[PDB]
Amino acid sequence: QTIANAEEEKTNVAAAEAEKISKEATEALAEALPALRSAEAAVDCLKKPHVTEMKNLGSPPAGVIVTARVVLILFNQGITLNDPDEKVWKKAVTFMNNPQAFIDKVKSFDGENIEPNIIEQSNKIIQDPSKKFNEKDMAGQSYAASKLCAWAVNIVTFNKIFKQVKPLQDAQKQANEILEEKKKELAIVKQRV
Structure with missing residues (x-):
């Protein structure tokens, strides 16, 4: 019984340490999750009225076309940037x-991390x-292109922040799972004792 009690105390201490680590990870992940939420709103900026203009645009602006290339990259339709505008x-x-x-x-x-190869080309x-694409310069060439670019920048920038947060979440989840397992082991072991 004394050996079992010592083992239970050690398991409880390990569980408490795991819980503290999980809590710190969750707080950091949570602040970054609202930052990612703001990025998601930026991605969300694109609307139904803006997309129809692109279809009825017809004339091709030098900058507006660039926005089309990044959209294809996100869609992973191929042809990279090698093909003519x-x-x-x-x-x-x-x-x-x-x-x-x-x-x-x-x-x-939107998915999660989409395609790794496509983000590189998009990041470049x-x-x-x-070639502008700062989401302010694009607006001057055409109003419709700025909304599409803004959403594309949010998706790319949104993917980077989301990816960092996805490691933060993984660390927090591992800590939480370890803490829960330790707590269950302690509870059942305490009842047996």
């Missing part, structure tokens, strides 16, 4: 054929200082 725009037009279908697909397409366009 005029050819790239026609593929973008098919997506914008039906405004309601495109808006519905965007919410479903955002990382490059040139």
